[PDB]
Design a protein around this ligand. Sequence first.
Ligand code: 0LG
Length: 375
Amino acid sequence: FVEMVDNLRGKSGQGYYVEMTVGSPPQTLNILVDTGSSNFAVGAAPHPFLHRYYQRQLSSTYRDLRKGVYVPYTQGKWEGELGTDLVSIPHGPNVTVRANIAAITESDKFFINGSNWEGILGLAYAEIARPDDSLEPFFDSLVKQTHVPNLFSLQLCGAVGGSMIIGGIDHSLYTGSLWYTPIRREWYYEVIIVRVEINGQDLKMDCKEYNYDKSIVDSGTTNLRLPKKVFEAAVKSIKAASSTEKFPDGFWLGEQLVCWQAGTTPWNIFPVISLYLMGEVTNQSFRITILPQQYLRPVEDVATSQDDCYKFAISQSSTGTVMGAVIMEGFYVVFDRARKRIGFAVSACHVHDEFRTAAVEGPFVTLDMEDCGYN
Ligand SMILES: CC(C)c1cccc(CNC[C@@H](O)[C@@H]2COC/C=C/C[C@@H](c3ccccc3)NC(=O)c3cc(cc(N(C)S(C)(=O)=O)c3)C(=O)N2)c1
């Protein structure tokens, strides 16, 4: 797995990407790793923000599937033409497999000026593939075509880099225990949140609320996104904990940055946030704790660089909870498809400071026998 270590790069909340090749002869593209969707898609026509794109006419292994496809995410949108071709991951397992590829020919607010990636690897299940669930996702083809075990793990670092280990778990990438929460249903990587605390204080809502109307693990979304009711309760609590300083409403909404004299950020006025995930046994849970160094994301800009400036990276959602890269960075996350479970452990690349450390820990029990799944 050592060959696979540090095979991810990124630009800081611009997304983590892995090098892949498509076509014969191999065309090199950087591909965003997305556990929040299930299409493999690449830029296939010129675009002002693409340094390079897939040229189907140059690949003798390309087969056209005579079917278009359109994919709108929460933000960003592309459309294109389906086909298959040979795909490999130079710093992944040593194999080449044939896979579906959407060749993107038009898009909106999807590619980013200077991002370095030219396509997207949807690693979730066929149930949410477009145009429908008969379009086998990349990781399904990989496992069917090779002897790779049905598991991958992500260590997203930033603050960027990281590792996606295909087929296994690399112990050098984490410390302490791995804790597992069940995948509720194979579509998104859907999980169940049973309790939320902000500086050790329970939000005290019915736990179904935390999962209204699903909770997902999504490396393709930057923020921790929360159902409105949870988001409003979370912000109330963070504000109360951090009340020695008062920030504008635009800060709370992600529309404005807050800035401090370089090196003087008052991390200790901001609370730790704990998400307790359903465990593998009845009414047991574990918690993952995040520090303000994860949920206050630095915005790099030479122009404001006398300061450190941050965006609040918790935001509201009308489509359920999204545990985005805010939650994943500094955890080693194991997508154990074979055992229908997702493991979390503290990563070798945790942020911590001299006072507080992100954690994955348990077990915790609750007598209340309510199931937290929203039907
Ligand atoms: C089943 C499919 C069709 C579907 C449909 C609807 C929702 C989903 C759930 N998964 C979404 C994921 O798949 C795509 C993937 O997008 C990858 C792009 C990353 C670029 C990055 C970025 C943009 C601009 C500057 C820096 C980074 N975007 C976000 O962080 C980025 C990306 C996305 C959402 C956000 N949020 C809205 S946010 C502002 O963090 O709250 C942020 C997003 O939609 N990501 C899935």
